Amino acid sequence: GETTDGVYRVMTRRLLGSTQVGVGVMQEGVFHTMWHVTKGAALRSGEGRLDPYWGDVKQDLVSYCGPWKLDAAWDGLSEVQLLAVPPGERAKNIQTLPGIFKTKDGDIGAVALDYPAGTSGSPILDKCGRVIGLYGNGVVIKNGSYVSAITQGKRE
Amino acid sequence: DMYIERAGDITWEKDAEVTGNSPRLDVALDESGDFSLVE
Ligand SMILES: CC(C)(CO)NC(=O)c1cccc(Cl)c1
C-alpha cells in the first residue's frame, strides 16, 4: 500500500457514506494513531493491509507494522503546532503555547484547541518538525471547549 | 473495514495561524484512558 512518511486520515464505510473517525502518523514504516480511533482493528491502505503491533487503552495509543517510533518531547517552554486534519477539510497548522495537565503521576503538556472528534490522532510538532505527541485524548471544560493532552508513546 | 488516505507532509509552517490559551488543569486518568477534571 502507501508507506510514505506523513499525516494520514483514518476513514470508515460502516456508517453513512465515507466517515473520518480519526488521523495518524506514518514514520519509519509504522502507522501511529490513538487507540479510541481504531479500537485495535486492522487497517487497509489501497491493496495493502496494516496489522496492529502494539497498543495500550490507558495511554490511548496504538502502532501498526512495528513498534512505536515517535520519541520527541515538548520542552515545557516553547510554542508548538497542531497539524490539524479535520473531517472533509485540508491539513492546517495551528500554532499555540501548550498549557499543563497536572496529575498525581507527573505533569504533561496540553493543547487547548476546538476541533471535531474525527480530528483525533493529528500530530503535535516542535520547531524542527518532530512529532512530540498526538492530539485527541483530553477533557471538555465549562463552556464546552476542548483541551487535549500532548499524548506521546515510548520508543523501545 | 477502516482505511487510510494521505493528507500531507509533517512540517512546521512559518507564519501559521496562532491561537488557543494555556490552562493549568488538575486532572485524573482512569484505567479506561479517560481524563477527567479534579477540583
Ligand atoms: C468539544 C469539541 C466538539 C470541540 O470542537 N471536541 C471534542 O469533543 C473532541 C473529543 C475528542 C477528541 C477531539 Cl480531537 C475532540
Curated annotation (Swiss-Prot), chain A:
Compartments reported by the entry: Host cytoplasm; Host endoplasmic reticulum membrane
Signal peptide span: none
Source organism, top-level taxon: Viruses
Post-translational modification: Acetylated by host KAT5. Acetylation modulates NS3 RNA-binding and unwinding activities and plays an important positive role for viral replication.
Domain Peptidase S7 residues, every copy: 1-156
Bilayer topology: Peripheral membrane protein
Residues forming the catalytic site: H36 (charge relay system), D60 (charge relay system), S120 (charge relay system)
The protein's role, per its UniProt record: Displays three enzymatic activities: serine protease, NTPase and RNA helicase. NS3 serine protease, in association with NS2B, performs its autocleavage and cleaves the polyprotein at dibasic sites in the cytoplasm: C-prM, NS2A-NS2B, NS2B-NS3, NS3-NS4A, NS4A-2K and NS4B-NS5. NS3 RNA helicase binds RNA and unwinds dsRNA in the 3' to 5' direction. Leads to translation arrest when expressed ex vivo. Disrupts host centrosome organization in a CEP63-dependent manner to degrade host TBK1 and inhibits innate immune response. Inhibits the integrated stress response (ISR) in the infected cell.
Oligomeric form and interacting partners: Forms a heterodimer with NS2B. Interacts with NS4B. Interacts with unphosphorylated RNA-directed RNA polymerase NS5; this interaction stimulates RNA-directed RNA polymerase NS5 guanylyltransferase activity. Interacts with non-structural protein 2A. Interacts with host SHFL; this interaction promotes NS3 degradation via a lysosome-dependent pathway. Interacts with host CEP63; this interaction disorganizes the centrosome and inhibits host innate immune response.
Listed name of the protein: Serine protease NS3
Organism: Zika virus
Lineage: Viruses, Riboviria, Orthornavirae, Kitrinoviricota, Flasuviricetes
Range of the intact protein held here: 1514 to 1669 of 3419
